[PDB]
Amino acid sequence: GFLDGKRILLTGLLSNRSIAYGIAKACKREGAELAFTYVGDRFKDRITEFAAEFGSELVFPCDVADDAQIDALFASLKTHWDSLDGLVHSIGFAPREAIAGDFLDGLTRENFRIAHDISAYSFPALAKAALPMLSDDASLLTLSYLGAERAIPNYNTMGLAKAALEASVRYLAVSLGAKGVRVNAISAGPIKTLAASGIKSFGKILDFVESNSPLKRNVTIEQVGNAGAFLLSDLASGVTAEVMHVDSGFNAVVGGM
Amino acid sequence: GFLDGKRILLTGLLSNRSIAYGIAKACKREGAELAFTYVGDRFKDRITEFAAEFGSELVFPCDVADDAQIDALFASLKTHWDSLDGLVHSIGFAPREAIAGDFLDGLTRENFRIAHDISAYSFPALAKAALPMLSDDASLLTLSYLGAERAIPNYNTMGLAKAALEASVRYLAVSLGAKGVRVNAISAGPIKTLAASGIKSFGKILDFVESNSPLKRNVTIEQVGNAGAFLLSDLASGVTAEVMHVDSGFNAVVGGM
Amino acid sequence: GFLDGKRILLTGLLSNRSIAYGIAKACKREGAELAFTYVGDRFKDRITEFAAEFGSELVFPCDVADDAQIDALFASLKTHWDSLDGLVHSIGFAPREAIAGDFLDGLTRENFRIAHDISAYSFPALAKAALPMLSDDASLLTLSYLGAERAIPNYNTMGLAKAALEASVRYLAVSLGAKGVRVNAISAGPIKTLAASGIKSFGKILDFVESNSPLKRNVTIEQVGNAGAFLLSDLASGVTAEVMHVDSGFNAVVGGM
Amino acid sequence: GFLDGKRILLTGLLSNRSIAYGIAKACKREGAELAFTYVGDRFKDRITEFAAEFGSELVFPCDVADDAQIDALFASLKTHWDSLDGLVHSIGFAPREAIAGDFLDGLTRENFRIAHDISAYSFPALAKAALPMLSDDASLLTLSYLGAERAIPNYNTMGLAKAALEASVRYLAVSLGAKGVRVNAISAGPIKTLAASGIKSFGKILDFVESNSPLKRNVTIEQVGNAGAFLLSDLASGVTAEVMHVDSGFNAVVGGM
Numbered sequence A, B, C, D: 001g002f003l004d005g006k007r008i009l010l011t012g013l014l015s016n017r018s019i020a021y022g023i024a025k026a027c028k029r030e031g032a033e034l035a036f037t038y039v040g041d042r043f044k045d046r047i048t049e050f051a052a053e054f055g056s057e058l059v060f061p062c063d064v065a066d067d068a069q070i071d072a073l074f075a076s077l078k079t080h081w082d083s084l085d086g087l088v089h090s091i092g093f094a095p096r097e098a099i100a101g102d103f104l105d106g107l108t109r110e111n112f113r114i115a116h117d118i119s120a121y122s123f124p125a126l127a128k129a130a131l132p133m134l135s136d137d138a139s140l141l142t143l144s145y146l147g148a149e150r151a152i153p154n155y156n157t158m159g160l161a162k163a164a165l166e167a168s169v170r171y172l173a174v175s176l177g178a179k180g181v182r183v184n185a186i187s188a189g190p191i192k193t194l195a196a197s198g199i200k201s202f203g204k205i206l207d208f209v210e211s212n213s214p215l216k217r218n219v220t221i222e223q224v225g226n227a228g229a230f231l232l233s234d235l236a237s238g239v240t241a242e243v244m245h246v247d248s249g250f251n252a253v254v255g256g257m
Ligand SMILES: NC(=O)c1ccc[n+]([C@@H]2O[C@H](COP(=O)([O-])OP(=O)(O)OC[C@H]3O[C@@H](n4cnc5c(N)ncnc54)[C@H](O)[C@@H]3O)[C@@H](O)[C@H]2O)c1
Pocket: A011, A012, A013, A014, A015, A017, A018, A019, A020, A038, A039, A062, A063, A064, A065, A089, A090, A091, A092, A093, A118, A143, A144, A145, A187, A188, A189, A190, A191, A192, A193, A194, A195, A196
């Protein structure tokens, strides 16, 4: 496959519905060797199974809120892999209040700090911590959402962080690209995943896009996973600092009229 | 003038070179009644003079890092003004390292947190704290920079925060617009101000834009001030959620070739 | 007012509902001296009345499809005015089929050619033809629509031309800006005007934006007019190559969900 | 490969340096069956050789300026292929004057009409003409340039048409997407090809981007070709209405400072 010999660290694989699960299947399929992270001791067993399913014995803890774990993630990885060709950042969080109802109502300095810390800062933080071992055709990929570009009901504080995240893709690409390292994002259309629970009326968004996207259908983690593999691969070697919509075209229309 | 009877609170007036100084002159000129904030007891005397020059006796402390001061700002303002028609947010900060040299080199969780806290979170925080007294044609305005849209040397962490800030304009506009309140940003071209010191090779940017902008000239705080007054006024009553470039057109070209 | 002594040529004033009618009122109000164009001998009497109402005796024919009339417009104008400080381009046309139903169905090379000829090419054509008499702080303004940015039902071929139109603003701004001439566009929200008749289900769009814009209300020609005056004035002297949304913020949201 | 069994019509293969040559190599490599077009009888022999090299005996004339040839292209294609899974539109033209020096200087109604006719209208024209035989996972791809987004020296009139072209991708995607057909564009960075001759100081652009792109290097037709294959393939099944930058990240930065 077009990822033969590529060694790719994936984060955010929490369930088989996860976007990262999709990216993993697509990568493994194309010849990639994978490793995975998890948050807390209580998820260690699940990700070990997941990693086994992709033929991997490489799982490592990493609460991205904690500098020590970030630094130790690559300290550990270093002992198994010589270098890294791919980093998937499929992580986010915002306090429930902050992604529910009115934007101002769920706004506190703490909520803001947390959403940005976890969803935005973590991407270039991992990149910095990975830099020593990154190869010269290495490739970083994060996940964004249209809520960064335009205001979307309930997405609120998360929208702001996603804006910062997408800017981080551009600054990262300039900072790492001299080393041959590419940095990109996929702005995925809505997918029913665990994190999607914290979005009030996700179902409404889901129906709206199935009704209004140009392809008249929602995207699957297989579709996003396929695009991710591409971006992670040398097929996308001319592509960096890009935010790629994989949302059946929804971003490009004014629907509902 | 087209701001007769409008009561406008301005922040970030630090010197006569400040962007907020420009906005104040333009507003006062158009009939507006002004009030101003400052950071710390040691700047109290300077802003009192400044306010005097605009015929105002209304100065209030506000380190936007501190919830208590934010809440007390409008508590104080309430005792003088019944309501507020205009809020200027002309505030930012990033640790010097974080806006110097390579993006990753100046990156720490703390730097990130601070830049975003001060430059991004503060705009909707002030809006939330102002909400009780805001009028029904009230108008909020913040200042952004092109570095939010594309990667610009040295702007680094500040670029990310400005992205979040611009997203905050859009979410703010949806949250406040039912009340008739408009929210906008001006993305100003480079102006030699005090904060511009912390930008390595500001002079290079300044020369580049004077050479490459369509109008072949840099913008002045008078030009930005004039645009701000407009946005703050009922002339811009159909305009909200907008990021307006006032940069002699620089954003719209690919210069240097 | 902030347009004292400015001499501004307006096009596209067809009725009192026209966007150009709004711009004219706002301009005249601010101290501007106006002149107007019309299409065909059979509209000569109506625009002469309109011009009278703005205290002007300056009406000139111009079907922008015809080179001769364009060239003769400024030949005539030259005999009355020494120079021109403002040009309003509030003109568009597309064959009815091309702005109705499915995009491909109403598509013919001729429809395409016509929509682009009239709605796009005419703006820089008039600019070229006006160049000799343009002053050194002169200002050109055209009208666009969100359909240029994203696909909107029925807007079809017109969306493509508007995209070209907005690009023309940018190239115009680089071409004219060394002479100190600014070029901008307003992307107005939907307004019931005569040209809006040719849009199937304009009423649906109108209801949608009143329900979904951040300000929850449609824009008036007074609101657009006010913004146009600003852009035409020296208040906007730092602003060129800009496409300014005056649409109650509609562009910035994903509504309907 | 990931294009096994896909039948793809390519246009614009003029030399081995052509962007379409790159796309063809990548497609053939991935298991695609190809066909090609050419302009005029005097290029028939060259494209027949080219097609041979990709193991194809399918060459067809098509000056996209002519309705008859467009209609006859798919009339002919129908006799060999039952249906079409991929259409590559790698075509453009503008009169030399219109892409040289000052924008206004090279501007005539005719130059405008021609550039738009050939570079913009032809894409949805071919799509309309192909519609009858298009499959249910078919995929259309055109080539754009950054000059559509921002003003670039010398690119002039071509910039306007490219803007219209990119809009066409969006309207096409809504029009064809209910049939399951995806439409996308690649905005490629500068590549020394035959058409690049008509760009004054192409060499200056080329040096600028090699010096200023995040990856510090120019893109090859292999890199664009690889991306095109992806977009044409079912790997990109969740992607439509997208304009994908393959330019080593150049679009995303403000270089030269
Ligand atoms: N679900 C959608 O519709 C959708 C659409 C567009 C983008 N996204 C984005 O896709 C990405 C992946 O989320 P998902 O939808 O696949 O849902 P998910 O619940 O499967 O994945 C979220 C992951 O974030 C991880 N996470 C949260 N806090 C963390 C921390 N402090 N440290 C490390 N990891 C942490 C969780 O462990 C989890 O695995 C997110 O960035 C999300 O914002 C999701």
